[PDB]
Design an enzyme around this catalytic site. Structure first.
Site, PDB file in Angstrom:
ATOM      1  N   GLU A  94       0.816  -1.205   0.000  1.00  0.00           N
ATOM      2  CA  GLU A  94       0.000   0.000   0.000  1.00  0.00           C
ATOM      3  C   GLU A  94       0.855   1.262   0.000  1.00  0.00           C
ATOM      4  O   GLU A  94       0.539   2.217  -0.714  1.00  0.00           O
ATOM      5  CB  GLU A  94      -0.942   0.017   1.206  1.00  0.00           C
ATOM      6  CG  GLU A  94      -2.061  -1.016   1.149  1.00  0.00           C
ATOM      7  CD  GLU A  94      -3.121  -0.694   0.113  1.00  0.00           C
ATOM      8  OE1 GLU A  94      -3.101   0.430  -0.431  1.00  0.00           O
ATOM      9  OE2 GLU A  94      -3.977  -1.569  -0.144  1.00  0.00           O
TER      10      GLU A  94
ATOM     11  N   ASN B 279      -7.819   9.360  -5.565  1.00  0.00           N
ATOM     12  CA  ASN B 279      -8.668   8.396  -6.240  1.00  0.00           C
ATOM     13  C   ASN B 279      -9.503   9.118  -7.282  1.00  0.00           C
ATOM     14  O   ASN B 279      -9.688  10.335  -7.230  1.00  0.00           O
ATOM     15  CB  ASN B 279      -9.600   7.669  -5.268  1.00  0.00           C
ATOM     16  CG  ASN B 279      -8.861   6.878  -4.218  1.00  0.00           C
ATOM     17  OD1 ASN B 279      -7.931   6.125  -4.512  1.00  0.00           O
ATOM     18  ND2 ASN B 279      -9.282   7.039  -2.974  1.00  0.00           N
TER      19      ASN B 279
ATOM     20  N   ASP C 158     -12.646   9.283  -7.766  1.00  0.00           N
ATOM     21  CA  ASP C 158     -13.848   9.962  -7.296  1.00  0.00           C
ATOM     22  C   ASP C 158     -13.544  11.212  -6.484  1.00  0.00           C
ATOM     23  O   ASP C 158     -14.477  11.828  -5.953  1.00  0.00           O
ATOM     24  CB  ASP C 158     -14.708   8.999  -6.470  1.00  0.00           C
ATOM     25  CG  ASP C 158     -14.018   8.521  -5.201  1.00  0.00           C
ATOM     26  OD1 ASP C 158     -12.906   9.003  -4.904  1.00  0.00           O
ATOM     27  OD2 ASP C 158     -14.602   7.654  -4.504  1.00  0.00           O
TER      28      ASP C 158
ATOM     29  N   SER D 220     -11.695  11.353  -3.667  1.00  0.00           N
ATOM     30  CA  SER D 220     -11.202  11.007  -2.345  1.00  0.00           C
ATOM     31  C   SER D 220      -9.693  10.752  -2.392  1.00  0.00           C
ATOM     32  O   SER D 220      -9.075  10.677  -3.462  1.00  0.00           O
ATOM     33  CB  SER D 220     -11.945   9.785  -1.799  1.00  0.00           C
ATOM     34  OG  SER D 220     -11.725   8.649  -2.611  1.00  0.00           O
TER      35      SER D 220
ATOM     36  N   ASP E 222      -6.298   8.636  -0.296  1.00  0.00           N
ATOM     37  CA  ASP E 222      -5.841   7.584   0.604  1.00  0.00           C
ATOM     38  C   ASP E 222      -4.622   8.077   1.375  1.00  0.00           C
ATOM     39  O   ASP E 222      -3.702   8.653   0.787  1.00  0.00           O
ATOM     40  CB  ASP E 222      -5.455   6.309  -0.156  1.00  0.00           C
ATOM     41  CG  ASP E 222      -6.628   5.623  -0.826  1.00  0.00           C
ATOM     42  OD1 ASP E 222      -7.781   5.884  -0.430  1.00  0.00           O
ATOM     43  OD2 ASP E 222      -6.380   4.808  -1.751  1.00  0.00           O
TER      44      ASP E 222
ATOM     45  N   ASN F 130      -8.969   5.611   3.382  1.00  0.00           N
ATOM     46  CA  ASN F 130      -9.655   6.401   2.366  1.00  0.00           C
ATOM     47  C   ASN F 130     -10.556   7.443   3.014  1.00  0.00           C
ATOM     48  O   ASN F 130     -11.346   7.123   3.907  1.00  0.00           O
ATOM     49  CB  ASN F 130     -10.484   5.465   1.480  1.00  0.00           C
ATOM     50  CG  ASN F 130     -10.990   6.119   0.207  1.00  0.00           C
ATOM     51  OD1 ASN F 130     -11.055   7.338   0.091  1.00  0.00           O
ATOM     52  ND2 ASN F 130     -11.362   5.285  -0.766  1.00  0.00           N
TER      53      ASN F 130
END
Ligand code: CL
Ligand code: CL
Ligand code: CL
Ligand code: CL
Ligand code: CL
Ligand code: NA
EC number: 3.2.1.17
Length: 129
Positions: free
Chosen positions: A35, A46, A48, A50, A52, A59
């Protein structure tokens, strides 16, 4: 902070992740590797809108507040910036809520694609724990 492999394993063990909800320590170290490459300061945006955050790439769509993810939830009740600290406590406590929400570690795409079903014990081999 960029953790070493055994350093992070020991920190995650001290914070109660070894066998948490049945997931052995190697699962958590493997997830963090893929990750974030063990880097507490990792961020990734991301599609959309958002973002991380942190060693486990939690998220903002659901789990933390970053002030720029409209319509999102803050289910760990923290600012997302708290997930970038060199102290991993906030990331661990939020991850415990995530892994308890019904889907286990499948919430972490990198875990599902690169750790699940492999010999994850190799990730803590050689470590003084
Ligand atoms: Cl490594
Ligand atoms: Cl393990
Ligand atoms: Cl927001
Ligand atoms: Cl700590
Ligand atoms: Cl499970
Ligand atoms: Na949010």
């Amino acid at each position: 902070k960029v953790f070493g492999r055994c350093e992070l394993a020991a920190a995650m063990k001290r914070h109660g992740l070894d066998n948490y909800r049945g997931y052995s320590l190697g699962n958590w170290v493997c997830a963090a590797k893929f990750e974030s490459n063990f880097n507490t300061q990792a961020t990734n945006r991301n599609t959309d809108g958002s973002t991380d955050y942190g060693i486990l790439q939690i998220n903002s769509r659901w789990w933390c507040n970053d002030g720029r993810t409209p319509g999102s939830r803050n289910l760990c009740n923290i600012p997302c910036s708290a997930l970038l600290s060199s102290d991993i406590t906030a990331s661990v406590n939020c991850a415990k809520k995530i892994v308890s929400d019904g889907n286990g570690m499948n919430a972490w795409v990198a875990w599902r694609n690169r750790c699940k079903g492999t010999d994850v014990q190799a990730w803590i081999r050689g470590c003084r724990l």
